[PDB]
PDB file of C-alpha atoms in Angstrom:
ATOM      1  CA  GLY A   1     -68.742-113.476 -43.680  1.00  0.00           C
ATOM      2  CA  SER A   2     -67.881-113.358 -39.984  1.00  0.00           C
ATOM      3  CA  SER A   3     -70.087-113.429 -36.885  1.00  0.00           C
ATOM      4  CA  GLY A   4     -70.190-114.686 -33.309  1.00  0.00           C
ATOM      5  CA  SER A   5     -71.361-112.805 -30.226  1.00  0.00           C
ATOM      6  CA  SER A   6     -73.641-109.763 -30.365  1.00  0.00           C
ATOM      7  CA  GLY A   7     -76.315-108.215 -28.167  1.00  0.00           C
ATOM      8  CA  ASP A   8     -76.206-104.600 -27.013  1.00  0.00           C
ATOM      9  CA  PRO A   9     -73.279-102.531 -28.356  1.00  0.00           C
ATOM     10  CA  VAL A  10     -72.093 -99.229 -26.889  1.00  0.00           C
ATOM     11  CA  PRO A  11     -74.805 -96.569 -26.433  1.00  0.00           C
ATOM     12  CA  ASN A  12     -75.583 -93.963 -29.092  1.00  0.00           C
ATOM     13  CA  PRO A  13     -76.219 -90.467 -27.669  1.00  0.00           C
ATOM     14  CA  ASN A  14     -76.776 -89.331 -31.257  1.00  0.00           C
ATOM     15  CA  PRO A  15     -80.231 -90.585 -32.323  1.00  0.00           C
ATOM     16  CA  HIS A  16     -80.495 -88.018 -35.118  1.00  0.00           C
ATOM     17  CA  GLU A  17     -77.507 -89.610 -36.851  1.00  0.00           C
ATOM     18  CA  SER A  18     -79.511 -92.842 -36.753  1.00  0.00           C
ATOM     19  CA  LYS A  19     -82.810 -91.447 -38.034  1.00  0.00           C
ATOM     20  CA  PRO A  20     -83.814 -92.325 -41.622  1.00  0.00           C
ATOM     21  CA  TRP A  21     -84.433 -88.697 -42.582  1.00  0.00           C
ATOM     22  CA  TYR A  22     -80.887 -87.985 -41.407  1.00  0.00           C
ATOM     23  CA  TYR A  23     -78.391 -87.405 -44.216  1.00  0.00           C
ATOM     24  CA  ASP A  24     -74.615 -87.447 -43.762  1.00  0.00           C
ATOM     25  CA  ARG A  25     -73.270 -87.832 -47.299  1.00  0.00           C
ATOM     26  CA  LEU A  26     -75.866 -85.575 -48.922  1.00  0.00           C
ATOM     27  CA  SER A  27     -75.253 -82.267 -50.697  1.00  0.00           C
ATOM     28  CA  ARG A  28     -77.448 -79.402 -51.895  1.00  0.00           C
ATOM     29  CA  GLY A  29     -76.899 -80.600 -55.450  1.00  0.00           C
ATOM     30  CA  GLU A  30     -79.170 -83.545 -54.683  1.00  0.00           C
ATOM     31  CA  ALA A  31     -80.797 -82.402 -51.442  1.00  0.00           C
ATOM     32  CA  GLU A  32     -82.847 -79.732 -53.214  1.00  0.00           C
ATOM     33  CA  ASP A  33     -83.579 -82.034 -56.153  1.00  0.00           C
ATOM     34  CA  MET A  34     -84.988 -84.693 -53.825  1.00  0.00           C
ATOM     35  CA  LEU A  35     -87.670 -82.351 -52.484  1.00  0.00           C
ATOM     36  CA  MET A  36     -88.480 -81.424 -56.083  1.00  0.00           C
ATOM     37  CA  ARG A  37     -88.950 -85.135 -56.775  1.00  0.00           C
ATOM     38  CA  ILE A  38     -91.446 -85.490 -53.926  1.00  0.00           C
ATOM     39  CA  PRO A  39     -94.967 -84.777 -55.243  1.00  0.00           C
ATOM     40  CA  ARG A  40     -95.924 -84.044 -51.635  1.00  0.00           C
ATOM     41  CA  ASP A  41     -96.383 -80.503 -50.323  1.00  0.00           C
ATOM     42  CA  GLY A  42     -94.657 -80.627 -46.949  1.00  0.00           C
ATOM     43  CA  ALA A  43     -91.436 -82.622 -47.182  1.00  0.00           C
ATOM     44  CA  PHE A  44     -88.339 -81.979 -45.071  1.00  0.00           C
ATOM     45  CA  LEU A  45     -84.781 -83.315 -44.884  1.00  0.00           C
ATOM     46  CA  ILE A  46     -81.857 -82.703 -42.529  1.00  0.00           C
ATOM     47  CA  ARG A  47     -78.296 -82.916 -43.848  1.00  0.00           C
ATOM     48  CA  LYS A  48     -74.864 -82.090 -42.432  1.00  0.00           C
ATOM     49  CA  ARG A  49     -72.177 -79.881 -43.975  1.00  0.00           C
ATOM     50  CA  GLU A  50     -68.499 -80.245 -43.076  1.00  0.00           C
ATOM     51  CA  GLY A  51     -66.744 -77.150 -41.763  1.00  0.00           C
ATOM     52  CA  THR A  52     -68.557 -76.059 -38.611  1.00  0.00           C
ATOM     53  CA  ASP A  53     -71.161 -77.297 -36.131  1.00  0.00           C
ATOM     54  CA  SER A  54     -73.933 -75.784 -38.253  1.00  0.00           C
ATOM     55  CA  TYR A  55     -76.510 -77.911 -40.068  1.00  0.00           C
ATOM     56  CA  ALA A  56     -79.150 -77.048 -42.667  1.00  0.00           C
ATOM     57  CA  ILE A  57     -82.649 -78.391 -43.304  1.00  0.00           C
ATOM     58  CA  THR A  58     -84.042 -78.436 -46.842  1.00  0.00           C
ATOM     59  CA  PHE A  59     -87.794 -78.568 -47.453  1.00  0.00           C
ATOM     60  CA  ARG A  60     -90.368 -77.897 -50.170  1.00  0.00           C
ATOM     61  CA  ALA A  61     -92.693 -74.887 -50.133  1.00  0.00           C
ATOM     62  CA  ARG A  62     -95.680 -75.345 -52.441  1.00  0.00           C
ATOM     63  CA  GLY A  63     -93.063 -76.378 -54.984  1.00  0.00           C
ATOM     64  CA  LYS A  64     -89.882 -74.386 -54.408  1.00  0.00           C
ATOM     65  CA  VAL A  65     -87.249 -75.535 -51.915  1.00  0.00           C
ATOM     66  CA  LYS A  66     -85.871 -73.423 -49.068  1.00  0.00           C
ATOM     67  CA  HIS A  67     -83.294 -74.064 -46.345  1.00  0.00           C
ATOM     68  CA  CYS A  68     -83.183 -73.179 -42.646  1.00  0.00           C
ATOM     69  CA  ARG A  69     -79.831 -72.644 -40.933  1.00  0.00           C
ATOM     70  CA  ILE A  70     -79.477 -74.666 -37.730  1.00  0.00           C
ATOM     71  CA  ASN A  71     -77.339 -73.318 -34.888  1.00  0.00           C
ATOM     72  CA  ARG A  72     -76.457 -74.479 -31.375  1.00  0.00           C
ATOM     73  CA  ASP A  73     -76.821 -72.745 -28.010  1.00  0.00           C
ATOM     74  CA  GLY A  74     -74.915 -74.786 -25.445  1.00  0.00           C
ATOM     75  CA  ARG A  75     -75.131 -78.514 -26.126  1.00  0.00           C
ATOM     76  CA  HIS A  76     -78.523 -77.601 -27.590  1.00  0.00           C
ATOM     77  CA  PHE A  77     -79.948 -77.240 -31.099  1.00  0.00           C
ATOM     78  CA  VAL A  78     -81.775 -74.116 -32.267  1.00  0.00           C
ATOM     79  CA  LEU A  79     -83.724 -74.078 -35.533  1.00  0.00           C
ATOM     80  CA  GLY A  80     -84.400 -70.363 -35.881  1.00  0.00           C
ATOM     81  CA  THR A  81     -86.393 -69.124 -32.898  1.00  0.00           C
ATOM     82  CA  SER A  82     -86.229 -69.644 -29.134  1.00  0.00           C
ATOM     83  CA  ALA A  83     -86.734 -73.402 -29.423  1.00  0.00           C
ATOM     84  CA  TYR A  84     -84.433 -75.490 -27.230  1.00  0.00           C
ATOM     85  CA  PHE A  85     -84.118 -79.143 -28.242  1.00  0.00           C
ATOM     86  CA  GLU A  86     -81.662 -81.567 -26.640  1.00  0.00           C
ATOM     87  CA  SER A  87     -81.661 -83.175 -30.087  1.00  0.00           C
ATOM     88  CA  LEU A  88     -82.997 -82.450 -33.575  1.00  0.00           C
ATOM     89  CA  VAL A  89     -85.290 -85.417 -32.938  1.00  0.00           C
ATOM     90  CA  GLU A  90     -87.455 -83.545 -30.433  1.00  0.00           C
ATOM     91  CA  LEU A  91     -87.354 -80.476 -32.680  1.00  0.00           C
ATOM     92  CA  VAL A  92     -88.869 -82.543 -35.492  1.00  0.00           C
ATOM     93  CA  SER A  93     -91.710 -83.929 -33.377  1.00  0.00           C
ATOM     94  CA  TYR A  94     -92.266 -80.480 -31.873  1.00  0.00           C
ATOM     95  CA  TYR A  95     -92.688 -78.777 -35.246  1.00  0.00           C
ATOM     96  CA  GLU A  96     -94.806 -81.669 -36.521  1.00  0.00           C
ATOM     97  CA  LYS A  97     -97.591 -79.956 -34.577  1.00  0.00           C
ATOM     98  CA  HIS A  98     -96.866 -76.320 -35.433  1.00  0.00           C
ATOM     99  CA  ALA A  99     -96.067 -74.815 -38.834  1.00  0.00           C
ATOM    100  CA  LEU A 100     -92.682 -74.258 -40.478  1.00  0.00           C
ATOM    101  CA  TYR A 101     -93.170 -71.817 -43.353  1.00  0.00           C
ATOM    102  CA  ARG A 102     -96.765 -70.595 -43.572  1.00  0.00           C
ATOM    103  CA  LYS A 103     -99.343 -73.348 -43.074  1.00  0.00           C
ATOM    104  CA  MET A 104     -97.469 -76.529 -43.992  1.00  0.00           C
ATOM    105  CA  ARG A 105     -95.348 -78.490 -41.518  1.00  0.00           C
ATOM    106  CA  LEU A 106     -93.043 -81.505 -41.260  1.00  0.00           C
ATOM    107  CA  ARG A 107     -95.385 -84.207 -42.556  1.00  0.00           C
ATOM    108  CA  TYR A 108     -93.388 -86.288 -45.035  1.00  0.00           C
ATOM    109  CA  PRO A 109     -89.752 -86.705 -43.916  1.00  0.00           C
ATOM    110  CA  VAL A 110     -87.866 -87.391 -47.147  1.00  0.00           C
ATOM    111  CA  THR A 111     -86.332 -90.857 -46.849  1.00  0.00           C
ATOM    112  CA  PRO A 112     -83.710 -92.803 -48.845  1.00  0.00           C
ATOM    113  CA  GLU A 113     -86.306 -95.504 -49.501  1.00  0.00           C
ATOM    114  CA  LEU A 114     -88.954 -93.136 -50.863  1.00  0.00           C
ATOM    115  CA  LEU A 115     -86.741 -91.618 -53.559  1.00  0.00           C
ATOM    116  CA  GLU A 116     -86.250 -95.122 -54.953  1.00  0.00           C
ATOM    117  CA  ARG A 117     -89.893 -96.130 -54.522  1.00  0.00           C
ATOM    118  CA  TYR A 118     -90.809 -92.911 -56.330  1.00  0.00           C
ATOM    119  CA  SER A 119     -88.455 -93.711 -59.208  1.00  0.00           C
ATOM    120  CA  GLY A 120     -88.302 -96.875 -61.292  1.00  0.00           C
ATOM    121  CA  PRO A 121     -90.356-100.082 -61.012  1.00  0.00           C
ATOM    122  CA  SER A 122     -87.590-102.042 -59.287  1.00  0.00           C
ATOM    123  CA  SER A 123     -84.759-101.076 -56.937  1.00  0.00           C
ATOM    124  CA  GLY A 124     -81.668-103.193 -56.352  1.00  0.00           C
TER     125      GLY A 124
END
């Protein structure tokens, strides 16, 4: 227990790392499972994998769960096609309109609060 002065700390040029659907300590082992736990047909989650500057997004396709390799093209993120996005954030909102696989599209961004709410009566 320690507090005192606090207002506006240093800026955060990485909003994605702050987003709720943003996973840092997540691994396929669970990542995939999560989607399988979501009774919704259109979930999506973005996790990071140590090693290189390449991320992967896991979603659910009418049941199954696929993954899309995320690359970078000069301080810019590139899902799969010619889609420049200063940050994954914009990429998410951009796709929200268009499709991702066939007809479905980012609608229910798997969150750490949902998994719990979708499992067990209480959570603490």
